[PDB]
């Protein structure tokens, strides 16, 4: 039955491709061509955050749009007050090889991990006056590339072993294991309502997972190389991916297919991070050519360039209120653009 | 600023003070990446190593330097995490000369690390291990069992020179040096070789990129 199953799988792939083609009545660039362009967007740095002595790998905004957490290879995880550029907390790590970090939506906990293969969760609002490790979540057999909190008790992580997992922080055990990728998983993005998430991997594909059921509902393909960053569109019906093809792509969840490709002939450098503005009109992406481009998400025009870094831009994010964009790079600085 | 903001600033300054102190303490270490074939002997390259599965970090002290050796084996997944070691001062590469079956694999590994975009100018310290077995094995399996494209004596000195030449042939950038050293399983004089190679490496890097 092995050949029959292989033929059935190929027939199903053809059926899916034909279904996707049938729905492609028009593309985004043929609909939005009548909308006034956003024009040139010129942003300036308003704050520079200094203190790390090594490459910064991850950065995440809190839900108050004022505090942010960053992690670097010097063994520190630092919580910053973005309005005054004060350091609020500095957490030493047991392993300096940190890939990701996260800031709980309540502001009570932070999390990070990397090569150790352990996701550590730190309790910030503690008695005794000092930040301490609350949990160490072990179970993955590869590096942790991304982790995001759903609530103070649930965290979802992505690993280098091709698996994603939903963890119960208090129990310390995995609750849901998400399998189906072939390559390592590089990025994770939660839906606005926490019910779904999208993961990107080195298979040049992304999968949409149902947090409660554990199954993959959709698989999106189109990139030629590894996908390093995924971000949901603010309304939850679309997401953008960045890859080593020097291309970003906007995918629609309802049409089950790619809607827009963001590329330029003068860009031959990879994409390290993606994000959207509060309204969804601007798409931001960090590149390993030491700058960050701002794209018009509806026309695929380049709206502007942020270019204050001396090394690879490793991370970026946008505040929940849309007031500012923060970036981090391998030059050990963070910058806030507005 | 209010009284609470002044106190917050004082806290921030104490945080910065401790961050600088830790940066200084960490700035005295020499970071070495350790790569090699399975069972190459890399785990015993230095008899003084302490261990303190992901990355296995070992360390030792010698003279007035603190050496931190990172074994990368646990991450059986690599370009996705190798750039974390871009700033290592040197790469130690271990080759087992006795086991012919592990060769070619070790040549592909050497070529891959030598031409990695993040290690194009990072020097390599190449250790050829178990010469005490190779020198006897060669009298029964005279190299051609492993490197059939060889025209030469079936002797210890010439087979060793040929293997070293094969490893050095993978260096395609004039800005990188490869150091070679022959060791025995019972040879304890490895800390001196690493120390001297690192000293020459740091000097060369101080002069190159200085516009010399």
């Amino acid at each position, epitope marked *: 039955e092995l050949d029959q199953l292989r033929q059935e799988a190929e027939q199903l792939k053809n059926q899916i491709r034909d279904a996707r083609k049938a729905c492609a009545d028009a593309t985004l660039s043929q609909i939005t061509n009548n909308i006034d362009p956003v024009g040139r967007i010129q942003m300036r740095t308003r704050r520079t955050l200094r203190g790390h002595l090594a490459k910064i790998y991850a950065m995440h905004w809190g839900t108050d749009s004022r505090l942010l957490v960053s992690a670097s290879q010097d063994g520190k995880l630092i919580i910053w007050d973005s309005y005054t550029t004060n350091k609020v*907390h500095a957490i030493p790590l047991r392993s300096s090889w940190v890939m990701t970090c996260a800031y709980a939506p309540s502001g009570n906990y932070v999390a990070c991990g990397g090569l150790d293969n352990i996701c550590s969760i730190y309790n910030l609002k503690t008695r*005794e006056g000092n930040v301490r490790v609350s949990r160490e979540l072990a179970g993955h057999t590869g590096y942790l590339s991304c982790c995001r909190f759903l609530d103070d008790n649930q965290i979802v992580t992505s690993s280098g072993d091709t698996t994603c997992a939903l963890w119960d922080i208090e129990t310390g055990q995995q609750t849901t294991t998400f399998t189906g990728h072939t390559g390592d998983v590089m990025s994770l993005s939660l839906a606005p309502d926490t019910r779904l998430f999208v993961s990107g991997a080195c298979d040049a594909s992304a999968k949409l997972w149902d947090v409660r059921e554990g199954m993959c509902r959709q698989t999106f393909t189109g990139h030629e190389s590894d996908i390093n960053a995924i971000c949901f569109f603010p309304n939850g019906n679309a997401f953008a991916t960045g890859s080593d093809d020097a291309t970003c792509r906007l995918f629609d969840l309802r049409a089950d297919q790619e809607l827009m490709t963001y590329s330029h002939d003068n860009i031959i450098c990879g994409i390290t991070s993606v994000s959207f503005s509060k309204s969804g009109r601007l798409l931001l992406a960090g590149y390993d050519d030491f700058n960050c481009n701002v794209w018009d998400a509806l026309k695929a025009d380049r709206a502007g360039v942020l270019a204050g870094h001396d090394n690879r831009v490793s991370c970026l994010g946008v505040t929940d209120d849309g007031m500012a964009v923060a970036t981090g790079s391998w030059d050990s600085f963070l910058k806030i653009w507005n | 600023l*209010s*009284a*609470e903001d002044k*106190a*917050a600033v004082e*806290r921030s300054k104490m945080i910065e003070k401790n961050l600088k102190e830790d940066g200084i303490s960490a700035a005295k270490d020499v970071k070495l990446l350790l790569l090699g074939a399975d069972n190459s002997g890399k785990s015993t390259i230095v008899k003084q190593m302490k261990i303190i599965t992901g990355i296995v970090e070992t360390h030792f002290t010698f003279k007035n330097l603190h050496f931190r050796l990172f074994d990368v084996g646990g991450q059986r997944s690599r370009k996705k995490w190798i750039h974390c070691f871009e700033d290592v001062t040197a790469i130690i590469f271990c080759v087992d000369l006795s086991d012919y079956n592990r060769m070619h694999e070790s040549l592909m590994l050497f070529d891959s690390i030598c031409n990695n975009k993040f290690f194009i100018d990072t020097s390599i310290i190449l250790f050829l291990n178990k010469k005490d077995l190779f020198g006897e094995k060669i009298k029964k399996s005279p190299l051609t069992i492993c490197f059939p494209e060889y025209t030469g004596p079936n002797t210890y000195e010439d087979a060793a020179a040929y293997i070293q030449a094969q490893f050095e042939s993978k260096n395609r950038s004039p800005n990188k040096e490869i150091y070679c050293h022959m060791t025995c399983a019972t040879d304890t004089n490895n800390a001196q070789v690493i120390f001297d190679a690192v000293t020459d490496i740091i000097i060369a890097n101080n002069l190159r990129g200085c516009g010399l």
Partner: single-chain antibody
Amino acid sequence: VQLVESGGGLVQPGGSRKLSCSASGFAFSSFGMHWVRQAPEKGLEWVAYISSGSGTIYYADTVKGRFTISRDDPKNTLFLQMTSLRSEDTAMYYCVRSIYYYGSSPFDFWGQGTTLTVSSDIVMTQATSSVPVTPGESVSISCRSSKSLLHSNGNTYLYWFLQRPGQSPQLLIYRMSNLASGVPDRFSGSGSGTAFTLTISRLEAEDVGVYYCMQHLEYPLTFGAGTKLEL
């Protein structure tokens, strides 16, 4: 978290004594420390402050030049060396910890006091000295200040404390509206510049004592006279 006071006792006028607070169960070196005193039948009065790292030291102007405040982090011990003691220095002395960072809650944990017996400022005014109360009642306690406590950074630096009979006071509300950890949601604070209110809904038992207003906008820190509830 524990703070234990020592020293004190009966001293003749003109002498000197050292008070000492032993801290346990917390990262003492990360907290600033305050001394607060309460005259036998009066309200609370601030005495002195040392910031973390001993960078900043402040004194009340009634003790300045006579008292020295110091700390010894390796032994988690705070000291106050008092000279030229006067009959007005008779009081219960409390050691209070505070930590300052964005979102922090200073003056949260107060220790037990020690009893010493000797043989420009913003004025806080309590609306009333005493409010009879009945359990199951809504009680509103209010204060006024001589200067607005609303700063340009958006924060209002008003604190509410409750001193139950026989106990050191505990923090109820910080920055005019932020309920302290461990305090039930029965308490609520509100106000505007120069005018503040504390509302207690569904008053319960062990909810009776003296309520104090404190400003923390600028040193020296001042307290109101205190409003007593009774059943």
